[PDB]
A paper describes a structure:
The structure of BovGH167 revealed four domains, three of which are often seen within the GH42 family. The conserved domains are domain A, the catalytic (α/β)8-barrel domain; domain B, a 5-stranded parallel β-sheet surrounded by α-helices; and domain C, an anti-parallel β-sandwich. The unique domain is an all α-helical region at the N-terminus. Structural alignment of BovGH167 with BbgII from Bifidobacterium bifidum S17 (PDB ID 4UCF39) revealed that E295 and E472 [E288 and E473 in GH167 (numbering for the predicted matured protein)] overlap with the acid/base and the nucleophile, respectively, with additional conserved residues in the −1 subsite. Further supporting this, GH167 was inactive on κ-NC4 but after treatment of κ-NC4 with S1_19B, which removes the 4-sulfate from the internal G4S residue converting the tetrasaccharide to β/κ-NC4, GH167 again produced products consistent with the formation of κ-NC2 and β-NC2. The activity of GH167 thus appears to have the same activity as the P. hydrolytica “GH42-like” enzyme whereby through hydrolysis of the β-1,4-linkage, the enzymes release β-NC2 from the non-reducing end of β-carrageen and/or hybrid carrageenans.
Carrageenans are high molecular weight polymers having a linear backbone of repeating D-galactopyranose units (G) linked together by alternating α-1,3 and β-1,4 linkages. Furthermore, transcriptomics revealed upregulation of the CarPUL during growth on ι-carrageenan, while biochemical analysis of eight CarPUL-encoded enzymes revealed carrageenan-specific activity, thus associating the CarPUL with the ability of these pseudoalteromonads to liberate energy from carrageenan. Detailed analysis of the enzyme activities encoded by the CarPUL, combined with interpretation of growth phenotypes, have allowed us to propose a refined and detailed model of κ- and ι-carrageenan processing by some Pseudoalteromonas species.
Residue numbers in the entry: 45 to 520, 526 to 775
Write the structure that this text describes.
Amino acid sequence: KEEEASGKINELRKLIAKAKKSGINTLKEETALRTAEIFMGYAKWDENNIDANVKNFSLVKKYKNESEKYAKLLPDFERQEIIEMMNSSISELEAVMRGELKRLPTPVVDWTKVKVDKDMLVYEGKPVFLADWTWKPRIKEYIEYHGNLDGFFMTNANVINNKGDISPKVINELQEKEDGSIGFVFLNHSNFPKWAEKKDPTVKDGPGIKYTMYDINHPLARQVNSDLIKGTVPYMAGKQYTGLGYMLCNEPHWNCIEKTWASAPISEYAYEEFRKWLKNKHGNIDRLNELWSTSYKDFSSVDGPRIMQASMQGSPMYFDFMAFNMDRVTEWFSFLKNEIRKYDPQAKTHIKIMPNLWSDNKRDSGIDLEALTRNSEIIGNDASSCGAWMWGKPKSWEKNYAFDWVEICMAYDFMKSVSPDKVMFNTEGHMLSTGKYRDLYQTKEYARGNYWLATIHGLTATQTWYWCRREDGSSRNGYAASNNHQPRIVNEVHATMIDLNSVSDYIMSFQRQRKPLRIFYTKASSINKAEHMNDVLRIYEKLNFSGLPIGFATEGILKNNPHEWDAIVVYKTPYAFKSDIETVQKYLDECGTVIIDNESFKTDEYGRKIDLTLKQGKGKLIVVSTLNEMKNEALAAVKSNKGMPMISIAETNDRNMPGCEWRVIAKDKNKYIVNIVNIGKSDATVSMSAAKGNIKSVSEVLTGLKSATKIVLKPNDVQLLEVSLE
């Protein structure tokens, strides 16, 4: 397969030179050719280092039993993937050269010239979308086609003394570092300097395991972070390598439920901050004593446990602890951002937030996705998707869906509800592999569908996990059967960016489209309930396959964002802040529509019967009993404001449920752009009609080929169609 692969590579290389002569933009095929050239060397390394790959595959649970076989077959698997990729590239380009496929213009992005503008990354006055790879060697061979993301890494360990002196190695790097390509600054928090630990060992208490291994409420922690930022950021300020911002922490969390993963008790400094937060929350100690059933003489005497028990969920002390943990974490990230802004007043910050700390049920992490998203100039995350785990009972998505769609659809939709006008930067993309998922045979169709779908929901740039391959093909649980062994996956991410760039105005219209239904979200219900996000997902899923972007409402969204929706839905939200209800009342008072079930808005965050109830007044207050009723009323509210899509879609499949998420935008008077992704785990047939009038024609935007009003999508398939009406 070595000789055969080299043959196809040489064939594509000559076809590229010929197409170029005709003025064809061969970026896509050059990207594939470069991928092939790189992975031929990786396959040669694999062929010469079988023993190293046996070890690599043994560390992977589903490839452990057959490790010797897998290490033997890997080199020819990689060459066979290159042969498939060259056959696809040669077929496509020969069709393009013969006028049989229409190739849209697409930019050759110079990353030294990309700028952030509102919710876009701009090259030569147009929106673009960026992909690079974690730990990829920054060499010419790898930055020509596979991304040119720059940046700078630092750690509080680079503060070498109490005086605030910075490691000379770090000063030397920053003095020499060129302006460079668009990049981000990575703040490390796992490595706190030993001199500080020796000076006051309490500085290690109440960590946010494992990525913040010191006390965010300790004064020596604040001195050290202030000293790091003061001594480094003046060298970075305004530089192109800071353009995608300052990443304030890797996967932060301060889990505080005893016997749970990455949990620890909070420090004594943190508990003193808790007494201050309780004084602000409750006003007088008598109000705390009534709720906690305690007899403290004042706020300084509060002296409850420094870690919570799962059995306490629903109690006032538990609520207070989790609410405080969120607020002090938000304040910590505010402190880091305000220190950076002193030395770089243009700094954009973000946080590598795990979206499942909002999309799953747990609220003990101190991660307030709304507050951290609002507080960030760039929407940071490391959203995961991927397929079935290598072990365990099926996840709930496996009944209906090809992959875990919940973070890149529902969490993205929450983040964009909070902040619609920001770039979104996935700083460790987990849409190809995780610790739990791996498949050597992962399809280019899966890879394209995922990056495409995530981009429809707001994703602007991705540093994908991960390019652990060194230039020689050696390695710097995660490695075997990751992208480091998959030539067609590495190539398809960049091919997807090329297509998204080619239609980036359409893509920004899909990202920005009116979200006319907002699901009400409150921390009052998520903190007190074991399974609030099961309920929020159930109503999201119920609404999300009707052609409409589905978004979220909170108190903060209603107070800070234009009310560009037709209705709020309130589902299984029995706990609410009084201020939630008051804010939803003000929306009814502006003639808003609220659709509420029988179970919602019954108590405050302490389970006390609520003094206040929603009154219809000038708006529309609709009480419903079922999910079906709630959906029927929601879509009626959109129809009443003429907000339904201009193209109607029906889906049939062998399941009980839709999987095709679809969207429609206007291209002009009688032409529409239809976006469809099959998130379902089996083939779906979509059937399209005009809402008014009659479909004249359907074509593929990317190919110019004629399509039909009835289409089969395989799982992970993407359709982008131009629909003309008569």
